[PDB]
Each structure stands twice: as C-alpha cells, then as structure tokens.
C-alpha cells in the first residue's frame, strides 16, 4: 500500500 508501481 505505498507506491508499489513498478
């Protein structure tokens, strides 16, 4: 749930 965008 932080910025887990690859």
């Amino acid at each position, epitope marked *: *749930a932080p910025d887990t*965008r690859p």
Partner: single-chain antibody
Amino acid sequence: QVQLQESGGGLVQPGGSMKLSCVASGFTFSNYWMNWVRQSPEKGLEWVAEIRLKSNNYATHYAESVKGRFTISRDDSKSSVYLQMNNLRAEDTGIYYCTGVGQFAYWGQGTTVTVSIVVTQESALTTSPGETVTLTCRSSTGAVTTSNYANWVQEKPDHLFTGLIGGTNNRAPGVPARFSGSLIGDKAALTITGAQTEDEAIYFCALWYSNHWVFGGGTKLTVLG
C-alpha cells in the same frame, strides 16, 4: 540516467520560511508518488512527506515532526515537486532530498538547509571482498512482514543515495545482482552475496506503517582486504 535535482536551500533564522524545489527527468514523473526525506548528523535519515498522483487528488501525508508547518506539492507539467517550509526550527537543519519510485530507487543530490516506532539496524558490520554479509532491520511494533514494504538504500560518500531494494525483495533497475532483499526471523534483511570493495557504504532500511515511513538508523558496512 534518471535525474532528480533539488534546489532552494540555504542559511536561515529560526521562525523563517523557505520553499525547496526538485526537478525530475528520465522517468514518467506523473505516474509516481514523490517524497521528501532529510538527513542530519543527529537524526540519520528522516522521512518528511509524501504526495501521491493527480488520480488521488494529490493526497499528502506528513511526518508528525513537520505536520502543520510543511506543505508538499507537485507540478506534473514541470516534472517538479516542492516543499514549503514554515516556522523553521533548529531541528529542521539537514540535507533535503526528493526521492521516489519502488519506493526510494531515485534520489537527488540534496539541498542543504541550515537553521541557526523505532526501526533498528546493526550500527556496523565488517566484511571482506567475496564474503556473504547480511544486514537486518527490526520493527519495535513486532514482526516485519511484506505489509511493511521494506526498502534498502545505500549512501556512498558525500551523500550519494541510491535505492537498492523495495517492496521487501524487488531489486531496483540496474542494481547489481549481488544485492537481495528478504525477510528472515521477523526482520527485513539485505544480503550481499560476494561483497565488493565499493560496497563499503552506509545502508538504510525503511519500513512502511499504513500511511508513513520510518527509516532505521543505518548500518556502516566496512569492506576490509
């Protein structure tokens, strides 16, 4: 080569105000959350603020230490993030970095500001070239889990920070394969499998707790021989 470049720091009196800027290049800035993190001799790395995307209506969160005094903002058209600092205190003194991506891959060189839960890591470890060394990162709250999204960041001399691992065990792009992230005995862990002389550096972990980050105190790794 992604680049982040902070500006706006200086030498200021307590009670004053100042706005920092950070310009990004080499990645799709608008797709990622951005953070400010600061470094003092006395408090190590401290996460300050985050800002999310245009689809989150640019939602922000702050460390309790700066809440009500600092404001983070961004301008996606200029690939820039900002930090408005009001009611500066001596304790705000430090080097301020903009950082983000998976979750702390990229850091700027920092801008110096001079005003005039506990995460535990090993103070120091000593290794030699070709050895396998494991650094650890403990939470005062209980076991570290994948819900803490452990990151590992390396500091090389004169404040050159690079993110190594995010999301527990995801290696940031172009990070050497000798680095790996894990969970071991309810701590997060960073393993260097075949340490190299250039790995002598300070290593910080950061753990996520639902809506904020806490950085550990860092481990000084010496590589002798």
